[PDB]
RNA sequence: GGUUAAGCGACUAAGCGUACACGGUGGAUGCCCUGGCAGUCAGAGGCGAUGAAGGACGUGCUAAUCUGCGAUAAGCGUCGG
RNA sequence: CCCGGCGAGGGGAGUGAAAAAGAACCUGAAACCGUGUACGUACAAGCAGUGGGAGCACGCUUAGGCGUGUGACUGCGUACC
RNA sequence: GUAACGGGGCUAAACCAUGCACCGAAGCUGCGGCAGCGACGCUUAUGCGUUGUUGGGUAGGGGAGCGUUCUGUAAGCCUGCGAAGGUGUGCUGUGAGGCAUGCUGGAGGUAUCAGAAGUGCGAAUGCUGACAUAAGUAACGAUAAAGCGGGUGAAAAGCCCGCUCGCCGGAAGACCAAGGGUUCCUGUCCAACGUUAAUCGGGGCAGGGUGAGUCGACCCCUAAGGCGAGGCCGAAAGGCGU
RNA sequence: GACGACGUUGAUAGGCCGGGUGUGUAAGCGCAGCGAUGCGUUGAGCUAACCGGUACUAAUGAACCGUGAGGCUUAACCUU
């Protein structure tokens, strides 16, 4: 139920070798507005594939 | 030239912040801002403000060029902890530690 | 669950009040001890 | 120089270890004493119904606490410095 | 004066012998947690050291075949009270 | 799980007899060094020429030393041309240690020979403070339930407004005593507090709010019981009671 | 996590169209009856995950990672 010995700081680091985050590879650019956005997502101004979807 | 920005006594554990800090070490400031903008972490908001402050300091206090800036050094240090009490069952009491951290960002044109 | 402390102002003063302590020789000695120690609140009067 | 075969063989570090450099956390050490401790030589050995010891509430150009004071309320008269 | 939410927290300027004395403030040790550099480590089994010892990096040096850090491989080796 | 040579293996690398080599310990020898105890040269206020011999060690006995704080020597000596303390490096002694010096620090330190002790820490499920581990793991407190539009804002699943949905309804509605004591209303703020965010709050700060001849208390009367002038009783304190 | 299919030169998912299956004669209207009900229109209406089809909606042009002929020695071969 509980440990018999204190784990070392090296073992702690090994367990955390899979905790690193992954950054986004790249961002898409809209044809008309020309701002960066997540792929398959609308832009901040309210654009998607140069169609000007609802902004409000 | 090297410019420094700091955020001391930030309400976040050092371990959590270090996850976001490792994503922008050695990257260009323009690319670093993009990475932080699309990271769903609370520490990302804190780090982004410090990075922006460092860029402003170089532009104003040193007359540097934004396009030439780059994140050369970034590290997070543990700060003072706040002690609290959390009641448990059968009259037992436990100690709660609210951890803080210091965030340092260095931007240079080299 | 009913607990041991059930407050009641009237019973508090009649049991540990200033006049209750002054009505007996032993009670008066309690005040003398607390006066010597320097207690800011001699009794539970208020 | 080319082809094939056989034998041999560096450059990787997701992480970790040791050494050094530079930091964070933390408040040890050194230095410091308007606080304590133990005595010596002299004082005074009692206060109170002319209201005591100890308290409550008030009192300032004054919101709070401390000190002083008591509706004459951080003070009044008189004699000296 | 500048970034920021007329924030928090910082970077300049100025004061001072000193701001790495900035009010979380003299000196600022250890446990503990980080960034950078050199070397070792992903076919090898156990109190983690000790004796032997290659290679690599660096500082010297009239190359003087030395010093410092690291430690592939190998003999022996089951903490303290 | 081979498991009755340690193993590989061996027809000698097994056994018996004889002989000659070699390996093998901190044992013995060789070279350098230190110390104890003996006798010798009457050496000397003793070290040697020498000279032999000894030196594992618990309980325990004997002998000799290191360092720390304080007092005298000291109205001396060192020190802002940088003291104590902190952190490295080099040298040095048989050991506890000592000396010099770079950086940090910014005002005290102290020879020699004597004197006095709150004089040396790894352990006592020792005491106090600080910081690790498990671990970014368990958990976030009744399974009555939420969905969308607009507003405010640096930021809205949680705040405000609106339309639906769901739950209690002999309560999860309304009014009081006891108890608490400003939690009440308005403006303003978001560090800490709220088990998340927060513009919101029983949170921070400032101002405002409690109006009685008839309600309650006080007041008049007494129950259980308490106290009790004299009194009765008891070493004192004190007990009972008109 | 992984593994398989597909991304407009497209049937991957939803919707839509047809069918099947399940339930068992919808609503409205008309007729009979004082009425509850019954009968006709009618095996009607509705129908999840299934079968066969269909680009109506969503699967965007890009960007990113991964390179540029691949060590030494020896023998046999090219030039048995």
Q: Is A19's Cβ below 8 Å from some Cβ in B?
A: yes
Q: In angstroms, what is the resolution?
A: 2.3
B70 token code pair: 């780059």
C40 token code pair: 């800011």
For chain B, the domain total comes to 1
Residues of chain A found within 8 Å of residue B13, distances taken between Cβ atoms: none
Please tell me the experimental approach by which this structure was elucidated: cryo-EM
Q: Where are the alpha helices (DSSP H) in chain B?
A: 14-21, 29-37, 42-61
Could you tell me which residues come within 8 angstroms of residue B83 by beta carbon, excluding any fewer than 6 positions away? Answer: B95, B96, B97
Q: Is A11's Cβ below 8 Å from some Cβ in B?
A: no
For chain C, the domain total comes to 1
Contact (CB<8Å) B35/A21: no
Q: Is A27's Cβ below 8 Å from some Cβ in B?
A: yes
Q: How far apart are CA B92 and CA B78, in angstroms?
A: 29
At B48, which CATH number? 3.90.470.10
Domain containing C16: what range? 1-46
For chain A, the domain total comes to 1
Task: Return the residue in B20, B23, B27 with the most chain A beta carbons within 10 A, the one to mutate for interface testing.
Answer: B23
Contact (CB<8Å) B23/A21: yes
3-state SS, chain A, equals: CCCCCCCCHHHHHHHHHHCCCCCCCCCEECCCCCCEECCCCCCCCCCCCCCCCCCC
At C19, which CATH number? 1.10.287.3980
Please give the interface size between A and B, counted as residue pairs whose CB atoms are below 8 Å apart: 18
Cα B27 to chain centroid distance, Å, stands at 15
Domain containing A13: what range? 1-56
Domain containing B78: what range? 1-110
User: Which run of H or of E encompasses C26?
Assistant: helix C25-37
Burial class (CB in 10 A: 0-12, 13-18, 19+), C5: exposed
């Amino acid at each position: 139920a509980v440990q018999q010995n204190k784990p070392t700081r090296s073992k702690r680091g090994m367990r955390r070798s899979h905790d690193a985050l992954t950054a986004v590879t790249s961002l898409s650019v809209d044809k008309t507005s020309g701002e960066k956005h997540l792929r398959h997502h609308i832009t901040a101004d309210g654009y998607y594939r140069g169609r000007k979807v609802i902004a409000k | 030239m090297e410019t420094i920005a700091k955020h001391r006594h930030a309400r976040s554990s050092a371990q959590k912040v270090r996850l976001v800090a490792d994503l922008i070490r050695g990257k260009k400031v323009s690319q670093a801002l993009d990475i932080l903008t699309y990271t769903n972490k609370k520490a990302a908001v804190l780090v982004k403000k410090v990075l922006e402050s460092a860029i402003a300091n170089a532009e104003h206090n040193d007359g540097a060029d934004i396009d030439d800036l780059k994140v050369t050094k970034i590290f997070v240090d543990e700060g003072p902890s706040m002690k609290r009490i959390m009641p448990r069952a059968k009259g037992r009491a436990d100690r709660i530690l609210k951890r803080t951290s210091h965030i340092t960002v260095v931007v240079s044109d080299r | 669950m009913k607990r041991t402390f059930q407050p009641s102002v009237l019973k508090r003063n009649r049991s540990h009040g200033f006049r209750a302590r002054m009505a007996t020789k032993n009670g008066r000695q309690v005040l003398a001890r607390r006066r010597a120690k320097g207690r800011a609140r001699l009794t539970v009067s208020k």
